[PDB]
């Protein structure tokens, strides 16, 4: 028993369920004190207060409520080679390669798994408070929404938790007796401290794990207080254990930005997107277009849950409850909006601090006033090695994004009308082309890279590739099921696009085909755009022949190299319609 052990909230009030998972970790773990989260503002800023009073943040006073985390260097982003999914076989979670290690994911027995948490979290929370965190994952009381409980001993991951996920007490009336994922963290210092503590940031490099186990339904994560290691709603839930949870279900949970976009008569449209690279979400997500009459509005820039509903919509709903984004970059001339949305109530973490009490990165494109110097993320004066960590963060409330879309927290979600896949390619491809099919639209989101990355989620498939990409293929069998437009997108080409704000120019074409405007020419690798279909006014003359050119030797070297990328790492799991996709796109460009 322990309840004499609860500083805020009650054992008796919890459900049965979540009172199990509580006090048997309790148990294990052995913590202090036992903290019941309720969501609200004083428990958030007088949390606030105490890591400031313990050296864990500081306030940072030129702005309204945000504040500054410094990490140990050690403990600065996810580890892949420490992040691992546990099945009883690993078939399952990754498919078997032909050759060397797969780059799909990494599987450990429940047995090895088994060895190592009892090497960790036996006594781990030692004269530490317990913080149980309970959040939703989606609008409170969606139908896509799902609903987990993070035990964790950093209180921030708690503050962390409150900006990136509903939670509170709220989120406890809601479940009540119904299911939910168990999300379990530690930093790994149980007190005394045995080895020394650097920088106010406990962590434990060496035994570092963050585990998955999909069957379970449980999320065990050790050692690590950075971002996608110890916010278990980020990565662990709605991408590693949720698309696990869609396959078994029917729905898909992707590495997408949602994004809604109105024409000058007011049509609006909704689009989802996946890059691999970091800024390129936010980038398009939070776009000012510079096309007169056209706005452009965020759902979310990170992780879309999508939904076929009974009348065959692609409904998606952001899970996420506010903005992890990557603080260098992120540019005042151009993301504005990102700028505008981190002013207030916002938590950094290994950014640069100015001396009148801002914050400061690489590529903020933004000249510090007279003597304004600079100290950097590991606490030294610095001089124009980085002021920040690139890695470093800031997590700041979705509803403060000044072009927030007002469909952003409607429970039965967005209807999305076209997916965008995205690629970082200096020669070859195309501004923009348009999938034949569906099934050729799957093996363009399986053909992707900027080392490959498979729809922007090589380190975050929750199971096998392979039937991952089948799954995907199931949905054109889904009765009355409207299927939506595939695009593939690449700004990079040589730069021969000017890119941010004019990439709307893009979206307009996008749009207008979902309309069913024949704006398109055939080529071997897709739809593209005819001649004078893009609004090119205010541009001046761009290379559209380059620009949209299709080379033979180019293409011939890319289905190659897919090729050999495929049957190595997919192997026996490649479902026979994506190897006809890609034999079908051979044949296309043998003939050219
Ligand atoms: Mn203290
Ligand atoms: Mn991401
Ligand atoms: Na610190």
């Given at each position: 028993?322990?309840?004499?052990?609860?500083?805020?909230?009650?054992?008796?009030?919890?459900?049965?369920?979540?009172?199990?998972?509580?006090?048997?970790?309790?148990?294990?773990?052995?913590?202090?004190?036992?903290?019941?989260?309720?969501?609200?503002?004083?428990?958030?800023?007088?949390?606030?207060?105490?890591?400031?009073?313990?050296?864990?943040?500081?306030?940072?006073?030129?702005?309204?409520?945000?504040?500054?985390?410094?990490?140990?260097?050690?403990?600065?982003?996810?580890?892949?080679?420490?992040?691992?999914?546990?099945?009883?076989?690993?078939?399952?979670?990754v498919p078997i390669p032909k050759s060397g290690q797969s780059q799909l994911?990494?599987?450990?027995?429940?047995?090895?798994?088994?060895?190592?948490?009892?090497?960790?979290?036996?006594?781990?929370?030692?004269?530490?408070?317990?913080?149980?965190?309970?959040?939703?994952?989606?609008?409170?009381?969606?139908?896509?929404?799902?609903?987990?409980?993070?035990?964790?001993?950093?209180?921030?991951?708690?503050?962390?938790?409150?900006?990136?996920?509903?939670?509170?007490?709220?989120?406890?009336?809601?479940?009540?007796?119904?299911?939910?994922?168990?999300?379990?963290?530690?930093?790994?210092?149980?007190?005394?401290?045995?080895?020394?503590?650097?920088?106010?940031?406990?962590?434990?490099?060496?035994?570092?794990?963050?585990?998955?186990?999909?069957?379970?339904?449980?999320?065990?994560?050790?050692?690590?207080?950075?971002?996608?290691?110890?916010?278990?709603?980020?990565?662990?839930?709605?991408?590693?254990?949720?698309?696990?949870?869609?396959?078994?279900?029917?729905?898909?949970?992707?590495?997408?930005?949602?994004?809604?976009?109105?024409?000058?008569?007011?049509?609006?449209?909704?689009?989802?997107?996946?890059?691999?690279?970091?800024?390129?979400?936010?980038?398009?997500?939070?776009?000012?277009?510079?096309?007169?009459?056209?706005?452009?509005?965020?759902?979310?820039?990170?992780?879309?849950?999508?939904?076929?509903?009974?009348?065959?919509?692609?409904?998606?709903?952001?899970?996420?409850?506010?903005?992890?984004?990557?603080?260098?970059?992120?540019?005042?001339?151009?993301?504005?909006?990102?700028?505008?949305?981190?002013?207030?109530?916002?938590?950094?973490?290994?950014?640069?601090?100015?001396?009148?009490?801002?914050?400061?990165?690489?590529?903020?494109?933004?000249?510090?006033?007279?003597?304004?110097?600079?100290?950097?993320?590991?606490?030294?004066?610095?001089?124009?090695?980085?002021?920040?960590?690139?890695?470093?963060?800031?997590?700041?409330?979705?509803?403060?994004?000044?072009?927030?879309?007002?469909?952003?927290?409607?429970?039965?979600?967005?209807?999305?009308?076209?997916?965008?896949?995205?690629?970082?390619?200096?020669?070859?491809?195309?501004?923009?082309?348009?999938?034949?099919?569906?099934?050729?639209?799957?093996?363009?989101?399986?053909?992707?890279?900027?080392?490959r990355?498979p729809?922007?989620?090589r380190?975050?498939?929750?199971?096998?590739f392979g039937?991952?990409?089948?799954?995907?293929?199931?949905?054109?069998?889904?009765?009355?099921?409207?299927?939506?437009?595939?695009?593939?997108?690449?700004?990079?080409?040589?730069?021969?696009?000017?890119?941010?704000?004019?990439?709307?120019?893009?979206?307009?074409?996008?749009?207008?085909?979902?309309?069913?405007?024949?704006?398109?020419?055939?080529?071997?690798?897709?739809?593209?755009?005819?001649?004078?279909?893009?609004?090119?006014?205010?541009?001046?003359?761009?290379?559209?022949?380059?620009?949209?050119?299709?080379?033979?030797?180019?293409?011939?070297?890319?289905?190659?190299?897919?090729?050999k990328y495929l049957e190595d790492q997919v192997n026996?799991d490649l479902?026979?319609?994506?190897?006809?996709?890609?034999?079908?796109?051979?044949?296309?460009?043998?003939?050219?």
């Amino acid at each position: 028993d322990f309840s004499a052990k609860v500083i805020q909230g009650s054992l008796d009030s919890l459900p049965q369920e979540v009172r199990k998972f509580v006090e048997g970790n309790a148990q294990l773990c052995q913590p202090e004190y036992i903290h019941i989260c309720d969501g609200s503002e004083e428990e958030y800023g007088r949390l606030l207060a105490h890591m400031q009073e313990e050296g864990v943040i500081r306030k940072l006073k030129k702005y309204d409520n945000c504040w500054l985390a410094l990490t140990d260097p050690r403990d600065v982003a996810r580890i892949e080679s420490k992040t691992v999914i546990i099945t009883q076989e690993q078939r399952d979670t990754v498919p078997i390669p032909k050759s060397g290690q797969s780059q799909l994911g990494r599987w450990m027995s429940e047995e090895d798994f088994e060895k190592a948490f009892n090497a960790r979290f036996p006594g781990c929370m030692k004269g530490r408070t317990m913080y149980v965190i309970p959040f939703s994952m989606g609008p409170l009381g969606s139908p896509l929404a799902k609903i987990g409980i993070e035990l964790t001993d950093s209180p921030y991951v708690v503050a962390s938790m409150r900006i990136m996920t509903r939670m509170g007490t709220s989120v406890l009336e809601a479940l009540g007796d119904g299911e939910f994922i168990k999300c379990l963290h530690s930093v790994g210092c149980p007190l005394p401290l045995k080895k020394p503590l650097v920088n106010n940031w406990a962590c434990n490099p060496e035994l570092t794990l963050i585990a998955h186990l999909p069957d379970r339904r449980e999320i065990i994560s050790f050692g690590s207080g950075y971002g996608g290691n110890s916010l278990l709603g980020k990565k662990c839930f709605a991408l590693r254990i949720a698309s696990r949870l869609a396959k078994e279900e029917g729905w898909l949970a992707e590495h997408m930005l949602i994004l809604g976009i109105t024409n000058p008569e007011g049509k609006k449209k909704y689009l989802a997107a996946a890059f691999p690279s970091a800024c390129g979400k936010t980038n398009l997500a939070m776009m000012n277009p510079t096309l007169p009459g056209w706005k452009v509005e965020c759902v979310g820039d990170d992780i879309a849950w999508m939904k076929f509903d009974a009348q065959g919509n692609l409904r998606a709903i952001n899970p996420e409850n506010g903005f992890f984004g990557v603080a260098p970059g992120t540019s005042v001339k151009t993301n504005p909006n990102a700028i505008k949305t981190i002013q207030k109530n916002t938590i950094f973490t290994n950014v640069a601090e100015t001396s009148d009490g801002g914050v400061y990165w690489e590529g903020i494109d933004e000249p510090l006033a007279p003597g304004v110097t600079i100290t950097s993320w590991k606490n030294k004066e610095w001089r124009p090695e980085p002021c920040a960590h690139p890695n470093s963060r800031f997590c700041t409330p979705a509803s403060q994004c000044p072009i927030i879309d007002p469909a952003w927290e409607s429970p039965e979600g967005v209807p999305i009308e076209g997916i965008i896949f995205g690629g970082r390619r200096p020669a070859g491809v195309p501004l923009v082309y348009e999938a034949l099919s569906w099934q050729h639209g799957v093996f363009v989101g399986a053909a992707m890279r900027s080392m490959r990355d498979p729809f922007a989620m090589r380190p975050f498939f929750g199971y096998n590739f392979g039937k991952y990409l089948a799954h995907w293929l199931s949905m054109a069998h889904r009765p009355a099921a409207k299927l939506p437009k595939i695009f593939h997108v690449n700004w990079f080409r040589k730069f021969l696009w000017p890119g941010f704000g004019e990439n709307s120019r893009v979206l307009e074409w996008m749009f207008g085909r979902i309309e069913g405007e024949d704006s398109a020419k055939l080529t071997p690798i897709g739809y593209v755009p005819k001649e004078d279909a893009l609004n090119l006014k205010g541009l001046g003359d761009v290379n559209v022949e380059e620009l949209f050119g299709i080379s033979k030797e180019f293409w011939e070297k890319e289905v190659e190299e897919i090729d050999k990328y495929l049957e190595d790492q997919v192997n026996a799991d490649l479902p026979y319609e994506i190897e006809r996709e890609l034999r079908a796109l051979k044949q296309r460009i043998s003939q050219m």
